[PDB]
Design a protein around this nucleic acid. Structure first.
Ligand SMILES: [Zn+2]
Lengths: 147, 409, 175, 182, 49
RNA sequence: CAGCGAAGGAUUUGGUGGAUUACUAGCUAAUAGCAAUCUAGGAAACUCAAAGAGUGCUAUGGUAUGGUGACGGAGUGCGCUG
């Protein structure tokens, strides 16, 4: 194989790491609520606090989201970076993300689940890391703007 | 005192690996075991390019570890961002290239071709063909002085100012072709190794070498200098690694009778010593120290704690490695060999806390532009290169040490 | 499946804008002739005249012993306002301490003075520009080059020290 | 590199990353962009020839004007440089410093005489055609563009037969014979 | 940079005097006021702003 | 249409494998070990770069917090202002 092929492989491996400001902007402007110019200027604290509000709304609708408030939506997860822990911690949080996605697959018609999984999109990069489970979970909604 | 209190403010910690048992030796720890034990970002930094058809690949990293410059022996020179997947020059110069280096950036690089040294821009267009630098085999850039230094099969050492464009110095080595070449990062003098077993320390002011050391017998295969400018490891072709004090010119260690001649040495920013003897790469920790208990051994005869066994080793079983280079601010060792590039996760092997206004691994396009203009503005003249850097504020070593009050005149 | 006529890419000095000689990557303006003018008459100027002096006119005035305002008055038979621009004054000051008499005869409260707004002290450029802008000025000069410039631009009367009094040429109402 | 400020233009003026003193105005680059030379070092292997003929013309000027060795060798050199068509006439030996040019020894190359006699229509397409292998000088095919010609062989620069662009121009002028297989 | 930035002349004030300035006095309480007198007996008070 | 004509026919293309020289096995410190181990012109764009110009943003240390028990707070006395 060729050098550009092997480098496309290392780009696909390092897809989520922000190695300068321009890649961080292009990578953090990928939101599910806001457009790119607002989404690039938002913080982690802002999107976390309104995603925690939306998870409280989603949890009082369906009470199986409270353990996701315990682990995936806690305040240690504001500073938890995805691509800094090993493969075993990665598989732990990726089956956490799979649990959240196949729990909240049914709830996709009501905006608290959009504002709640906004934080999985922007903190844990599940649109590019945990992407097969995201497509498979929301496959039903294909005539809808959320898909 | 206040400058030394900054070690609280230092963000990161250095890496390591520690045995935690007496059965668990450290040189028998495998690279797949490291890649399982460390995180996904570092495991993805440990790249491997299998480029089989062109020759053994001389490796080179930019001075922040952002860009990689490989040269095949046949013609294949590629400058790339090895940690994204972005290459920005892939040019096949069908004559035998030997070496390359970046100049002050990823934006220009100099390659040493069949005879002439060429200089290429960021995307690979040829900027310059140097009519001097007749047969280079070793290029190295002096970044604070903006000088491309060139040595090779001719017995000549040439310093070329990259900014003005002007050949600063031509010096007769007078000792045949230059077998090895390294730069002291401390004081920017060039240690060249000849076929006499002689290292000579050179400056572009004096047409004679500043110092001539008798390192080895036979020729001198490789030289590496610490970034503190204190120790120098030279491998000769007489199967002899030798650790040298640079400042006082004592010989610290003499590891004679290596099993096969060490073809490369390198010294990391945290003082590891990476020797390479063909298929084998072997790294020692704390080998550049004064005491005889820091002499690098290969085994500990009966479990002696006062024997510096290898910190880690690796075997490139197919091939013979071309050169070694540590990745600057990361825990990796990039070795270029016959079938391309391999990074090795060496945990003790990089400055965890860089300074971001000397040279920044996260630097942007605007920061590159302004830092280029600012370092160009504070470029040091080539005459200020002395054996010690602190000798350009002083008075003459003539001109009597007491100032004179005109009564005594 | 390579390409034919393959070359090594070098830089193009004719094309590359990264180098300096290739850093060079409509509304007309025809200024109307002045409404102060007939064909070459300058029908609009009327006494009290105002006269722009320069340095060799002052030097020739003192060398011929003519007063400035009285020489102007008995040349034109009208009331004159003489004007020293700051560049003419700069030129007289730069002439040194040999020309102290000329400088402190130009320092005269009867000689009013303009304020030129440009860099440098080239009085010929300043006088030519401010006279071809406005056409309400007499130019008193003795430079041959400035005399040729002024008498080539139309509608501008020219005064000059000739003999033992001032003469005036392109003013068609002197008697 | 940054289009420096004014205290910048003044503080360092001789800095120029693009064009140095020893580039000689990039005349090698300029003339190989003109006559479209494939690889590097052709310019300097012509410039060595120019320097050698001006050096030996200098030492033929050195020798006294009466000996037949000198006069036979300068007329022999002048006739050989006419015979390879570097010159256009057999004039003065002062033309062996005024008129020998690395330009003219590039003018005798095979793509540029092809553009000269309108066989191609640009020198780039000439190098296209002779890398694709269509032309010949006399019997033998020419593959490399570095084959410059002599004064006799500007008459037998012709394509090969079965060259299909020759067949397209024959069927353009509909003189296309096919008994001669092209 | 100092030897190229050395542009010390601010400007002359007014039109000067007629006969050369032989006396000057600043006032020690206001920043910009200046009195000057020449050889022909004229004195002037100046706003230096 | 005729003709050809077996649960279909034609064109184009991506990937991989085998040949493109005449087949004596991998590694290493090699008379042997190991192999589980050596060690004790044009078009497109969420494309990639190189530069230029303008605009936006409190863009705010004229010499940086009220305080290394060397300190702070309270009160008194001196000082200061009208
Ligand atoms: Zn003026």
């Amino acid at each position: 194989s060729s050098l550009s092929d092997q480098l496309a492989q290392v780009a696909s491996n390092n897809a989520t790491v922000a190695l300068d400001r321009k890649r961080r902007q292009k990578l953090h402007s990928a939101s599910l609520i806001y457009n790119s110019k607002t989404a690039a200027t938002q913080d982690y604290d802002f999107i976390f606090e309104n995603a925690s509000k939306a998870l409280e709304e989603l949890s009082q609708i369906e009470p199986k989201f409270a353990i996701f408030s315990r682990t995936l939506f806690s305040e240690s997860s504001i500073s938890l970076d995805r691509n800094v822990q090993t493969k075993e911690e990665i598989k732990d949080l990726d089956n956490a993300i799979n649990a959240y996605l196949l729990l909240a697959s049914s709830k996709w018609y009501l905006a608290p689940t959009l504002h709640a999984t906004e934080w999985l999109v922007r903190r844990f990069q599940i649109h590019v890391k945990n992407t097969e489970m995201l497509l498979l979970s929301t496959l039903n909604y294909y005539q809808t703007p959320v898909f | 005192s206040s400058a030394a209190a900054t070690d609280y403010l230092l963000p990161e910690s250095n890496g390591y690996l520690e045995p935690e048992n007496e059965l668990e030796k450290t040189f028998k720890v495998q690279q797949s075991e490291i890649k399982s034990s460390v995180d996904v970002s570092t495991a993805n930094k440990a790249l491997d390019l299998s480029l089989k058809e062109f020759g053994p690949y001389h490796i080179k990293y930019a001075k922040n570890g952002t860009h990689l410059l490989i040269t095949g022996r046949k013609g294949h020179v590629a400058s790339m961002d090895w940690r994204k997947g972005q290459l920005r020059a892939e040019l096949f110069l069908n004559e035998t290239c030997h070496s390359a280096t970046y100049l002050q950036n990823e934006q220009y690089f100099a390659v040493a071709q069949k005879k002439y040294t060429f200089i290429y821009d960021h995307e690979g267009t040829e900027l310059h063909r140097l009519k001097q630098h007749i047969e280079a085999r070793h290029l190295d850039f002096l970044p604070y002085h903006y000088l491309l230094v060139t040595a090779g099969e001719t017995g000549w050492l040439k310093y070329h100012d990259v900014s003005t464009g002007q050949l600063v110095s031509e010096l007769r080595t007078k000792a045949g072709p230059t077998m090895a070449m390294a730069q002291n990062p401390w004081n920017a003098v060039m240690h060249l190794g000849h076929s006499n077993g002689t290292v000579s320390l050179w400056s572009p002011s004096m047409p004679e070498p500043l110092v001539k050391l008798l390192s080895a017998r036979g020729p001198v295969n490789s030289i590496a200098i610490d970034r503190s400018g204190y120790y120098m490891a030279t491998t000769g072709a007489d199967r002899s690694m030798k650790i040298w004090d640079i400042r006082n010119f004592k010989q610290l260690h003499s590891v004679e009778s290596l099993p096969t001649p060490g073809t490369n040495v390198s010294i990391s920013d945290t003082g590891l010593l990476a020797l390479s003897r063909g298929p084998h790469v072997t790294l020692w920790k704390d080998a550049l120290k004064l005491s005889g208990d820091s002499k690098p051994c290969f085994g500990s005869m009966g479990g002696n704690p006062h024997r510096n066994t290898p910190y880690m080793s690796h075997l490139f079983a197919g091939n013979k490695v071309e050169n070694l280079g540590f990745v600057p601010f990361e825990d990796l060792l990039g070795v270029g060999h016959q079938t391309g590039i391999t990074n090795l996760i060496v945990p003790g092997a990089g400055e965890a806390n860089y300074d971001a206004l000397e040279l920044n691994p996260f630097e942007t396009k605007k920061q590159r532009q302004e830092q280029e203009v600012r370092t160009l503005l504070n470029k040091l003249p080539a005459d200020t290169i002395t054996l010690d850097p602190n000798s350009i504020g002083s008075v003459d070593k003539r001109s009597s040490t007491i100032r004179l009050n005109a009564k005594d005149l | 499946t390579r390409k034919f006529g393959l070359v090594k890419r070098t830089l193009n000095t004719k094309k590359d804008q990264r180098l300096k000689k290739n850093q060079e990557n409509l509304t007309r303006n025809i200024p109307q002739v002045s409404s102060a003018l007939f064909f070459q008459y300058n029908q609009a100027i009327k006494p009290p005249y105002q006269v722009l002096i320069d340095t060799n006119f002052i030097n020739f005035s003192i060398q011929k012993k003519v007063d400035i305002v009285r020489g102007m008055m008995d040349c034109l038979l009208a009331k004159c306002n003489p004007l020293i621009t700051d560049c003419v004054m700069a030129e007289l000051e730069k002439l040194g301490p040999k020309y102290r008499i000329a400088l402190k005869l130009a320092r005269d409260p009867r000689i009013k003075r303009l304020s030129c707004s440009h860099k440098g002290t080239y009085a010929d450029d300043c006088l030519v520009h401010r006279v071809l802008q406005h056409k309400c000025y007499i130019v008193a000069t003795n430079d041959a080059g400035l005399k040729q410039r002024i008498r080539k631009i139309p509608g501008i009367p020219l005064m000059s020290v000739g003999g033992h009094a001032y003469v005036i040429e392109k003013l068609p109402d002197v008697f | 590199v940054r289009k420096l400020k004014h205290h910048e233009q003044k503080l360092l003026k001789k800095v120029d990353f693009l064009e140095w003193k020893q580039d000689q105005g990039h005349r090698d680059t300029q003339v190989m962009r003109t006559y479209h030379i494939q690889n590097r070092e052709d310019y300097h292997k012509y410039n060595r020839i120019c320097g050698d003929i001006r050096r030996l013309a200098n030492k033929l000027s050195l020798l006294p004007p009466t000996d037949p060795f000198r006069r036979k060798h300068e007329q022999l050199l002048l006739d050989k440089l006419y015979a390879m068509g570097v010159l256009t006439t057999k004039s003065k030996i002062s033309d062996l410093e005024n008129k020998v040019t690395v330009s003219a020894i590039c003018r005798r190359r095979l793509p540029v005489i092809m553009h000269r006699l309108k066989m191609a229509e640009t020198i780039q397409d000439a190098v296209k055609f002779i890398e694709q292998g269509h032309v010949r000088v006399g019997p033998n095919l020419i593959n490399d563009p570095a084959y410059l010609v002599t004064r006799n062989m500007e008459d037998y620069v012709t394509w090969v037969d079965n060259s299909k662009i020759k067949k397209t121009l024959l069927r353009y002028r509909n003189q296309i014979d096919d008994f001669d297989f092209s | 940079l100092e030897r190229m930035f050395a542009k010390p002349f601010v400007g002359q004030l007014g039109y000067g005097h007629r006969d050369g300035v032989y006396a000057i006095a600043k006032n020690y309480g206001s920043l910009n006021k200046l009195a000057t007198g020449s050889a022909d007996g004229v004195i002037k008070y100046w706003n230096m702003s």
